Amino acid sequence: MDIYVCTVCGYEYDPAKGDPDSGIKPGTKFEDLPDDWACPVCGASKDAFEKQ
Ligand SMILES: [Fe+3]
């Protein structure tokens, strides 16, 4: 289960934590984020993330 990192700002999307503020429950894999999901810290698109 992969952590993904925002190439713009360095925020880490952690699947074990999800992103409740965006309606993403804990345990949601990166692949299951919608394409309109954005980095909570900098606003960059999901497609700006890379696998850590
Ligand atoms: Fe970011």
Counted domains in the chain: 1
Q: Please name the residues in contact with 52: beta carbons below 8 A apart, sequence gap of 6 or more.
A: 2, 3, 4, 5, 12
**CA nearest to 27, candidates 18, 39, 38, 40:** 18
19 is known to lie in a ligand binding site:
no
Helix ranges (H only) for 8-47 are none
Residue 37's φ and ψ, nearest 5 degrees, are -70, 140
The CA 8 to ligand 1 mean position distance, Å, reads 5
44 is known to lie in a ligand binding site:
no
For residue 47, the SS3 value is helix
Cα–Cα distance, 9 to 6 (Å, whole number): 6
Block residue for tokens 């925002």 = 6
Domain residues for the domain of 43 are 1-52
CATH of the domain at 25: 2.20.28.10
The CA 50 to ligand 1 mean position distance, Å, reads 11
Decide if 11 contacts 22 (C-beta within 8 A).
no
**CA nearest to 43, candidates 8, 2, 19, 12:** 8
Tell me the residues surrounding ligand 1 (ion) with CB < 5 Å.
Answer: 6, 8-9, 11, 39, 41-42, 44
